[PDB]
Amino acid sequence: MRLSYEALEWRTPIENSTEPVSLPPPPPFFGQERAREALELAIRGGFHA
Amino acid sequence: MRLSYEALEWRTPIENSTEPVSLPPPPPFFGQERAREALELAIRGGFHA
Amino acid sequence: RALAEEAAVLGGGLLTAESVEQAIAAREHRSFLSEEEFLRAVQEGVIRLRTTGRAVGEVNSLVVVEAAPYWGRPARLTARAAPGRDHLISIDREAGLGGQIFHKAVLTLAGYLRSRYIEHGSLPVTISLAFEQNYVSIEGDAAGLAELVAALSAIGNLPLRQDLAVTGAVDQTGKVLAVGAINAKVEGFFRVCKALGLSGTQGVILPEANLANLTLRAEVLEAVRAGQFHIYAVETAEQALEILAGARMEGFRGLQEKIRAGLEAFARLEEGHDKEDRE
Amino acid sequence: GGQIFHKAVLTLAGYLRSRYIEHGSLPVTISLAFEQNYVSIEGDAAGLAELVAALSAIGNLPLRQDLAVTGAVDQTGKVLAVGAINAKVEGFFRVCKALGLSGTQGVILPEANLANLTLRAEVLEAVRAGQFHIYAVETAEQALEILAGARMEGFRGLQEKIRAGLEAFARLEEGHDKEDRE
Numbered sequence: 001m002r003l004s005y006e007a008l009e010w011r012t013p014i015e016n017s018t019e020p021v022s023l024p025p026p027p028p029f030f031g032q033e034r035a036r037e038a039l040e041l042a043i044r045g046g047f048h049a
Numbered sequence: 050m051r052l053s054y055e056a057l058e059w060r061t062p063i064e065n066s067t068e069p070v071s072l073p074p075p076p077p078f079f080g081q082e083r084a085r086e087a088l089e090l091a092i093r094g095g096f097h098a
Numbered sequence: 099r100a101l102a103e104e105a106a107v108l109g110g111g112l113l114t115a116e117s118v119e120q121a122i123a124a125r126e127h128r129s130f131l132s133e134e135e136f137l138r139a140v141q142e143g144v145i146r147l148r149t150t151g152r153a154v155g156e157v158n159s160l161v162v163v164e165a166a167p168y169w170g171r172p173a174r175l176t177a178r179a180a181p182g183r184d185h186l187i188s189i190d191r192e193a194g195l196g197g198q199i200f201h202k203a204v205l206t207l208a209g210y211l212r213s214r215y216i217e218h219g220s221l222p223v224t225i226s227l228a229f230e231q232n233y234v235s236i237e238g239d240a241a242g243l244a245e246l247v248a249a250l251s252a253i254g255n256l257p258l259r260q261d262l263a264v265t266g267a268v269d270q271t272g273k274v275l276a277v278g279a280i281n282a283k284v285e286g287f288f289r290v291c292k293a294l295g296l297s298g299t300q301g302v303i304l305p306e307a308n309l310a311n312l313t314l315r316a317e318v319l320e321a322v323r324a325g326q327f328h329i330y331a332v333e334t335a336e337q338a339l340e341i342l343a344g345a346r347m348e349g350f351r352g353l354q355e356k357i358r359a360g361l362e363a364f365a366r367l368e369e370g371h372d373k374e375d376r377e
Numbered sequence: 378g379g380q381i382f383h384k385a386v387l388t389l390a391g392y393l394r395s396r397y398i399e400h401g402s403l404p405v406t407i408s409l410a411f412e413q414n415y416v417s418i419e420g421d422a423a424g425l426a427e428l429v430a431a432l433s434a435i436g437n438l439p440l441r442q443d444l445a446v447t448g449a450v451d452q453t454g455k456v457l458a459v460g461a462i463n464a465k466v467e468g469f470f471r472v473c474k475a476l477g478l479s480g481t482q483g484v485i486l487p488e489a490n491l492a493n494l495t496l497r498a499e500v501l502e503a504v505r506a507g508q509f510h511i512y513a514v515e516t517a518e519q520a521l522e523i524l525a526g527a528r529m530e531g532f533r534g535l536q537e538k539i540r541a542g543l544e545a546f547a548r549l550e551e552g553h554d555k556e557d558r559e
Contacts, residue, residue: 050331059314145458193383194381376558
């Protein structure tokens with residue numbers, strides 16, 4: 001069955017590009033909650049990691 | 050045959066989750082009476098173990 | 099003591115039940131990346147496993163992954179029967195060696211199939227056993243119950259339930275032997291079913307020798323109590339096939355009748371080919 | 378190439394010997410080859426292209442050369458996901474564009490790779506304009522139906538064509554055996 005363009009389109013639509021973005025820095029290990037939690041536990045408990 | 054929940058439940062029931070408990074220290078090699086007796090024999094007889 | 103230390107860290111110093119279960123959950127989740135990737139692939143359709151309806155010659159064999167952490171997960175085991183000499187091919191055991199290595203798992207399944215069904219001479223079927231996707235690391239020492247039930251379904255054109263995953267080892271007698279890491283396999287299948295959505299009929303067929311080893315997680319047991327997940331304990335491959343195919347081995351419209359009918363059909367194709375070659 | 382027995386050859390042989398059954402054995406020998414050697418063929422996985430090519434050879438089915446076929450299959454015939462789907466689709470698009478697009482070229486890729494389908498801008502624009510097509514298949518039968526432009530069931534279907542090809546090969550074998558016997 002043929003896949004239409006809408007079913008294949010994956011790119012994020014750009015609404016504007018003349019404005020320079022100003023965003024706050026992300027927390028360390030962003031999108032890496034597992035690693036952040038493991039390191040939190042290792043630091044708080046003094047565990048070799 | 051199909052195993053029921055009561056034939057699969059293995060966790061012991063919890064009466065309470067907030068009440069600190071005090072227990073006497075267990076004797077050395079608790080549940081290890083074989084190793085404890087072997088070491089007792091080795092120490093009393095001077096045997097290499 | 100290490101788990102207690104982790105619970106104290108997550109509990110602030112006091113090891114409450116909540117703190118200990120949090121420590122256990124965190125320890126389980128810290129090595130959960132492989133299972134997270136597998137579940138995401140299953141949900142996205144990259145790895146398509148059947149957890150509803152029925153299929154012929156296909157089972158959800160529970161396996162343990164190659165990774166150092168021991169995570170159970172289902173893999174689609176497929177068996178295909180063709181007319182010919184009595185020769186059972188384990189495709190994922192002859193993938194790169196060849197030459198009849200005598201894997202002791204092909205020998206066991208071949209012995210069961212040759213001794214159990216005797217209406218001709220050499221078995222009139224050749225069985226090809228394979229795993230869809232390659233993470234299984236199939237054990238060579240012990241033949242699988244899933245392999246046997248898939249071979250029987252392929253021979254007899256038996257639609258087996260895809261709801262139930264099949265795990266366990268079998269010898270030539272048909273008795274299902276205990277397998278290690280039964281909890282991991284059951285929990286992996288339950289994770290897959292929950293990711294795909296529980297239909298209230300998915301379950302696991304596991305050896306009754308592992309009943310003393312079923313220390314299942316809280317979530318799986320809660321599902322079992324609610325009736326959304328079932329656990330079947332079997333002693334022989336015959337009753338596992340009965341549970342999968344939803345009918346009895348003996349009697350009218352039995353499983354033995356269908357399997358012997360399939361074997362007779364393959365033998366008839368053999369003899370018709372011989373006659374056509376002769377004339 | 379002694380021993381080993383591969384996993385692709387065993388998979389294709391199992392599918393062919395189980396799906397098409399009128400004699401005690403498959404009456405054909407299938408020789409699969411790639412033209413030029415830059416392929417880096419995977420010995421651990423069967424190919425959907427290999428299976429459809431074998432089926433076309435058996436049944437004398439004219440496959441569309443417009444469509445490129447990628448994807449792995451098991452002995453059931455289920456088309457499995459394959460790595461680097463974007464690279465393969467974009468490479469076939471580059472080849473078609475270099476030779477000139479006719480508005481009918483396309484790629485037959487597993488539906489398991491729709492999660493992995495992040496195509497370049499040019500390929501997506503061509504698909505939007507209708508100059509390039511993408512087909513998602515669940516089983517090798519669907520891929521063969523798309524390639525041969527015919528259904529697997531009904532009058533003059535691909536199933537009966539492949540079965541008639543095997544029957545003709547079996548007739549040749551039995552005639553040769555009868556001649557050699559006497």
